[PDB]
Write an enzyme that holds these catalytic residues in place. Structure first.
Site, PDB file in Angstrom:
ATOM      1  N   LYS A   7      33.470  52.104  29.279  1.00 50.09           N
ATOM      2  CA  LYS A   7      33.014  52.016  30.666  1.00 50.09           C
ATOM      3  C   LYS A   7      34.045  51.283  31.518  1.00 50.09           C
ATOM      4  O   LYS A   7      34.329  51.687  32.649  1.00 50.09           O
ATOM      5  CB  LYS A   7      31.676  51.290  30.737  1.00 50.09           C
ATOM      6  CG  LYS A   7      31.058  51.195  32.135  1.00 50.09           C
ATOM      7  CD  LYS A   7      29.620  50.613  32.066  1.00 50.09           C
ATOM      8  CE  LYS A   7      28.961  50.463  33.435  1.00 50.09           C
ATOM      9  NZ  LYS A   7      28.125  49.228  33.528  1.00 50.09           N
ATOM     10  N   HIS A  12      37.669  51.122  35.838  1.00 55.27           N
ATOM     11  CA  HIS A  12      38.640  50.172  36.350  1.00 55.27           C
ATOM     12  C   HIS A  12      40.083  50.443  35.996  1.00 55.27           C
ATOM     13  O   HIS A  12      40.951  49.732  36.526  1.00 55.27           O
ATOM     14  CB  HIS A  12      38.281  48.759  35.865  1.00 55.27           C
ATOM     15  CG  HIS A  12      36.947  48.282  36.375  1.00 55.27           C
ATOM     16  ND1 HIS A  12      36.675  48.121  37.715  1.00 55.27           N
ATOM     17  CD2 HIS A  12      35.807  47.950  35.718  1.00 55.27           C
ATOM     18  CE1 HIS A  12      35.434  47.702  37.861  1.00 55.27           C
ATOM     19  NE2 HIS A  12      34.883  47.588  36.662  1.00 55.27           N
ATOM     20  N   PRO A  42      29.128  49.924  45.606  1.00 51.75           N
ATOM     21  CA  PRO A  42      29.639  49.337  46.852  1.00 51.75           C
ATOM     22  C   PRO A  42      31.070  48.804  46.781  1.00 51.75           C
ATOM     23  O   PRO A  42      31.790  48.876  47.778  1.00 51.75           O
ATOM     24  CB  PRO A  42      28.638  48.211  47.156  1.00 51.75           C
ATOM     25  CG  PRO A  42      27.497  48.442  46.238  1.00 51.75           C
ATOM     26  CD  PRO A  42      28.003  49.139  45.047  1.00 51.75           C
ATOM     27  N   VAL A  43      31.474  48.193  45.673  1.00 51.05           N
ATOM     28  CA  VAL A  43      32.830  47.648  45.551  1.00 51.05           C
ATOM     29  C   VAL A  43      33.338  47.977  44.162  1.00 51.05           C
ATOM     30  O   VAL A  43      32.607  47.817  43.185  1.00 51.05           O
ATOM     31  CB  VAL A  43      32.879  46.126  45.782  1.00 51.05           C
ATOM     32  CG1 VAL A  43      34.296  45.613  45.597  1.00 51.05           C
ATOM     33  CG2 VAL A  43      32.410  45.785  47.179  1.00 51.05           C
ATOM     34  N   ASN A  44      34.587  48.449  44.071  1.00 50.87           N
ATOM     35  CA  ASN A  44      35.178  48.734  42.770  1.00 50.87           C
ATOM     36  C   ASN A  44      36.693  48.651  42.813  1.00 50.87           C
ATOM     37  O   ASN A  44      37.325  49.110  43.765  1.00 50.87           O
ATOM     38  CB  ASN A  44      34.746  50.122  42.267  1.00 50.87           C
ATOM     39  CG  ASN A  44      35.121  50.349  40.827  1.00 50.87           C
ATOM     40  OD1 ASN A  44      34.510  49.769  39.931  1.00 50.87           O
ATOM     41  ND2 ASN A  44      36.124  51.184  40.590  1.00 50.87           N
ATOM     42  N   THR A  45      37.265  48.078  41.758  1.00 51.10           N
ATOM     43  CA  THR A  45      38.703  47.875  41.660  1.00 51.10           C
ATOM     44  C   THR A  45      39.303  48.720  40.536  1.00 51.10           C
ATOM     45  O   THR A  45      38.779  48.732  39.412  1.00 51.10           O
ATOM     46  CB  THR A  45      39.006  46.397  41.434  1.00 51.10           C
ATOM     47  OG1 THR A  45      38.469  45.600  42.509  1.00 51.10           O
ATOM     48  CG2 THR A  45      40.522  46.205  41.327  1.00 51.10           C
ATOM     49  N   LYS A  66      32.261  34.576  37.372  1.00 46.73           N
ATOM     50  CA  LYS A  66      31.428  34.336  38.543  1.00 46.73           C
ATOM     51  C   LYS A  66      29.970  34.068  38.172  1.00 46.73           C
ATOM     52  O   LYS A  66      29.287  33.301  38.871  1.00 46.73           O
ATOM     53  CB  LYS A  66      31.515  35.518  39.511  1.00 46.73           C
ATOM     54  CG  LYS A  66      32.782  35.641  40.333  1.00 46.73           C
ATOM     55  CD  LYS A  66      32.695  36.964  41.159  1.00 46.73           C
ATOM     56  CE  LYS A  66      33.857  37.156  42.103  1.00 46.73           C
ATOM     57  NZ  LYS A  66      34.027  38.613  42.494  1.00 46.73           N
ATOM     58  N   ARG A  85      36.070  49.937  48.869  1.00 46.75           N
ATOM     59  CA  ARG A  85      34.921  49.284  49.480  1.00 46.75           C
ATOM     60  C   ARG A  85      34.190  50.259  50.383  1.00 46.75           C
ATOM     61  O   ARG A  85      34.798  50.866  51.270  1.00 46.75           O
ATOM     62  CB  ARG A  85      35.332  48.039  50.282  1.00 46.75           C
ATOM     63  CG  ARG A  85      35.660  46.832  49.408  1.00 46.75           C
ATOM     64  CD  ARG A  85      36.774  45.960  49.998  1.00 46.75           C
ATOM     65  NE  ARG A  85      37.091  44.846  49.109  1.00 46.75           N
ATOM     66  CZ  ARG A  85      36.226  43.918  48.716  1.00 46.75           C
ATOM     67  NH1 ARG A  85      34.998  43.858  49.212  1.00 46.75           N
ATOM     68  NH2 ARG A  85      36.600  43.029  47.798  1.00 46.75           N
ATOM     69  N   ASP A 121      35.859  41.045  36.913  1.00 43.08           N
ATOM     70  CA  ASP A 121      35.151  39.983  37.617  1.00 43.08           C
ATOM     71  C   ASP A 121      35.705  39.750  39.010  1.00 43.08           C
ATOM     72  O   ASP A 121      34.934  39.597  39.971  1.00 43.08           O
ATOM     73  CB  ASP A 121      35.203  38.677  36.816  1.00 43.08           C
ATOM     74  CG  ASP A 121      34.012  37.784  37.086  1.00 43.08           C
ATOM     75  OD1 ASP A 121      32.867  38.310  37.032  1.00 43.08           O
ATOM     76  OD2 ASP A 121      34.226  36.559  37.333  1.00 43.08           O
TER      77      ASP A 121
HETATM   78  O1  LIG Z   1      36.914  42.624  43.142  1.00 47.09           O
HETATM   79  C1  LIG Z   1      35.988  43.206  42.634  1.00 47.09           C
HETATM   80  C2  LIG Z   1      34.554  42.708  42.688  1.00 47.09           C
HETATM   81  C3  LIG Z   1      33.569  43.431  42.107  1.00 47.09           C
HETATM   82  N1  LIG Z   1      33.863  44.701  41.383  1.00 47.09           N
HETATM   83  C4  LIG Z   1      32.870  45.486  40.728  1.00 47.09           C
HETATM   84  O2  LIG Z   1      31.595  45.213  41.430  1.00 47.09           O
HETATM   85  C5  LIG Z   1      30.651  44.882  40.306  1.00 47.09           C
HETATM   86  C6  LIG Z   1      29.635  43.925  40.789  1.00 47.09           C
HETATM   87  O3  LIG Z   1      30.261  42.694  40.920  1.00 47.09           O
HETATM   88  P1  LIG Z   1      29.882  41.734  42.191  1.00 47.09           P
HETATM   89  O4  LIG Z   1      30.706  40.510  42.188  1.00 47.09           O
HETATM   90  O5  LIG Z   1      28.500  41.243  42.091  1.00 47.09           O
HETATM   91  O6  LIG Z   1      30.119  42.577  43.578  1.00 47.09           O
HETATM   92  P2  LIG Z   1      30.538  41.787  44.949  1.00 47.09           P
HETATM   93  O7  LIG Z   1      29.649  40.637  45.160  1.00 47.09           O
HETATM   94  O8  LIG Z   1      30.255  42.639  46.106  1.00 47.09           O
HETATM   95  O9  LIG Z   1      32.105  41.260  44.895  1.00 47.09           O
HETATM   96  P3  LIG Z   1      32.917  40.796  46.266  1.00 47.09           P
HETATM   97  O10 LIG Z   1      34.334  41.180  46.248  1.00 47.09           O
HETATM   98  O11 LIG Z   1      32.466  41.567  47.431  1.00 47.09           O
HETATM   99  O12 LIG Z   1      32.777  39.153  46.552  1.00 47.09           O
HETATM  100  P4  LIG Z   1      31.753  37.992  45.927  1.00 47.09           P
HETATM  101  O13 LIG Z   1      31.406  38.222  44.522  1.00 47.09           O
HETATM  102  O14 LIG Z   1      32.451  36.710  45.850  1.00 47.09           O
HETATM  103  O15 LIG Z   1      30.411  37.852  46.867  1.00 47.09           O
HETATM  104  P5  LIG Z   1      30.588  37.789  48.504  1.00 47.09           P
HETATM  105  O16 LIG Z   1      30.564  39.137  49.081  1.00 47.09           O
HETATM  106  O17 LIG Z   1      31.948  37.353  48.835  1.00 47.09           O
HETATM  107  O18 LIG Z   1      29.434  36.815  49.174  1.00 47.09           O
HETATM  108  P6  LIG Z   1      29.707  35.725  50.385  1.00 47.09           P
HETATM  109  O19 LIG Z   1      31.069  35.208  50.481  1.00 47.09           O
HETATM  110  O20 LIG Z   1      29.411  36.239  51.721  1.00 47.09           O
HETATM  111  O21 LIG Z   1      28.902  34.517  50.243  1.00 47.09           O
HETATM  112  C7  LIG Z   1      31.511  44.309  39.227  1.00 47.09           C
HETATM  113  O22 LIG Z   1      30.886  44.475  37.944  1.00 47.09           O
HETATM  114  C8  LIG Z   1      32.732  45.115  39.281  1.00 47.09           C
HETATM  115  O23 LIG Z   1      32.506  46.334  38.493  1.00 47.09           O
HETATM  116  C9  LIG Z   1      35.210  45.173  41.340  1.00 47.09           C
HETATM  117  O24 LIG Z   1      35.451  46.157  40.758  1.00 47.09           O
HETATM  118  N2  LIG Z   1      36.241  44.428  41.971  1.00 47.09           N
END
Ligand SMILES: O=c1ccn([C@@H]2O[C@H](COP(=O)(O)OP(=O)(O)OP(=O)(O)OP(=O)(O)OP(=O)(O)OP(=O)(O)O)[C@@H](O)[C@H]2O)c(=O)[nH]1
EC number: 4.6.1.18
Length: 124
Positions: A7, A12, A42-45, A66, A85, A121
């Site tokens: 996966k 990734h 919603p977000v993926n790298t 995290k 994004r 992460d």
């Molecule tokens: O760089 C990234 C970050 C995430 N992912 C994928 O997404 C899945 C869910 O992981 P999650 O951390 O919960 O998603 P997100 O909060 O939106 O991450 P984010 O980049 O948006 O940022 P953060 O985790 O830090 O939360 P935030 O949006 O900043 O909240 P806030 O500052 O307003 O208080 C992960 O398993 C990864 O498969 C990725 O591929 N590259």
């Protein structure tokens, strides 16, 4: 079922391209890697390095995940990545993404025997 390590590769890894040149890269790749099948992820790298290079991160800098687990690892070197994004106009099933290219240190969680990446992460 799909293994966690498999996966991680599907979600990734993209060693076939040195970097997102195409504004369209995420639209295409989020779809072709099945990240938009049941909802718009919603977000993926995607990481543009060899699988060996990314697997090696599992023996690099140990950092907190995290979610507070302790099995995350940060790459000593920057790597080429693409962040996808989802846009605000995006509406499933027509998921739409902004394609952002950067060179950053990646942070992955590793598990197993062999000890391999199972989760992306963060990038820093
Ligand atoms: O760089 C990234 C970050 C995430 N992912 C994928 O997404 C899945 C869910 O992981 P999650 O951390 O919960 O998603 P997100 O909060 O939106 O991450 P984010 O980049 O948006 O940022 P953060 O985790 O830090 O939360 P935030 O949006 O900043 O909240 P806030 O500052 O307003 O208080 C992960 O398993 C990864 O498969 C990725 O591929 N590259």
């Amino acid at each position: 079922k799909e293994t966690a390590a498999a996966k991680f590769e599907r979600q990734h890894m993209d060693s076939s391209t040195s970097a997102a040149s195409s504004s369209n890269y995420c639209n295409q790749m989020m779809k072709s890697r099945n990240l938009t099948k049941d909802r718009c992820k919603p977000v993926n790298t995607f990481v543009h390095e060899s699988l060996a290079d990314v697997q090696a991160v599992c023996s690099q800098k140990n950092v907190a995940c995290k979610n507070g687990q302790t099995n995350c690892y940060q790459s000593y070197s920057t790597m080429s990545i693409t962040d996808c994004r989802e846009t605000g106009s995006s509406k499933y099933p027509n998921c739409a993404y902004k394609t952002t290219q950067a060179n950053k240190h990646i942070i992955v969680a590793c598990e197993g025997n062999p000890y391999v990446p199972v989760h992306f992460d963060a990038s820093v």
